[PDB]
């Protein structure tokens, strides 16, 4: 199918307590493969997937060099942004940056993206055309025009359509055992007596990959979405994911309820009944 590479950068100022904390992570699809943490002792970009560990010294020296440079950029950004917003020097602030690319089933360039946020809200983002910018506010406008004049977009476009997809394809090849698999969810239902006249039916999906999945409860067919407690998909910690969905049901009515599971790794949608 299609695939994606994404890099996530977070920088947090710590006034009067040294330089800001910088953390970087890389993902291919739903699999993390690298990280950098400015408070760690190594000071190198580090592997977080078995299929990336043997990439070689050049690869590791290079990402380390570039990620430190990202760290310095965010450090200047925090200083700049505080100025744009005329803010106190004592408070901690946060810059976030995401960029990456998608390829299609044919592994051809599909799209690219490059976005910042300041204190948890949109700041400036690259448009889908990869040539123009969207500025959230007045502060960002200054960035907008500065990047327009510096031809910043063109150079981002060169990376996104080249290096970014070039290496995405290389990683998909290296880790094709991990990255080009789908693990179908192992599903089951549990029953718990909430009272003498009520019970919890919980529908479980376990050990699946990728993260995308739909769990829906129905009574006679009518979506019980409004009465469904649904948890966020969560990491099991071994590279697989978990999700569940529960309804409170009148005792005696269990047979009216079905759980429907859609996932990429399933040949067909699953319909679980209690019986």
């Amino acid at each position: 199918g299609s695939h994606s590479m994404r890099y996530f950068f977070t920088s947090v100022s710590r006034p009067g307590r040294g330089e800001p904390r910088f953390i970087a992570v890389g993902y291919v699809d739903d699999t993390q493969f690298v990280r950098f943490d400015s408070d760690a002792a190594s000071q190198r970009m580090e592997p977080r997937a078995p299929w990336i560990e043997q990439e070689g010294p050049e690869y590791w020296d290079g990402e380390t060099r570039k990620v430190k440079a990202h760290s310095q950029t965010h450090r200047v950004d925090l200083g700049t942004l505080r100025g744009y917003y005329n803010q106190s020097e004592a408070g901690s602030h946060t810059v976030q940056r995401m960029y990456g690319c998608d390829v299609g089933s044919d592994w051809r360039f599909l799209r690219g993206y490059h976005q910042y946020a300041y204190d948890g809200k949109d700041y400036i983002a690259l448009k889908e055309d990869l040539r123009s910018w969207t500025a959230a506010d007045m502060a960002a406008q200054t960035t907008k025009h500065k990047w327009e004049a510096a031809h910043v977009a063109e150079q981002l476009r060169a990376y996104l359509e080249g290096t970014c997809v070039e290496w995405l394809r290389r990683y998909l090849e290296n880790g094709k055992e991990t990255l080009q698999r789908t693990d179908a969810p192992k599903t089951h239902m549990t029953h718990h007596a909430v009272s003498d006249h009520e019970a919890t039916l919980r529908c479980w999906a376990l050990s699946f990959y990728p993260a995308e999945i739909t769990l829906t409860w129905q009574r006679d067919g009518e979506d019980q979405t409004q009465d469904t407690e649904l948890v966020e998909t969560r990491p099991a910690g071994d590279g697989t994911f978990q999700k569940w969905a529960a309804v409170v049901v009148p005792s005696g009515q269990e047979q009216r309820y079905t759980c429907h599971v859609q996932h990429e790794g399933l040949p067909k949608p699953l319909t679980l009944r209690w019986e």
């Binding site: 290079g62 570039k66 440079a69 990202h70 950004d77 960035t143 150079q155 981002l156």
Partner: peptide, 9 residues
């Protein structure tokens, strides 16, 4: 791989 550039706000 990360971008080699140095874009700044």
């Amino acid at each position: 791989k990360l971008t080699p550039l140095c874009v700044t706000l």
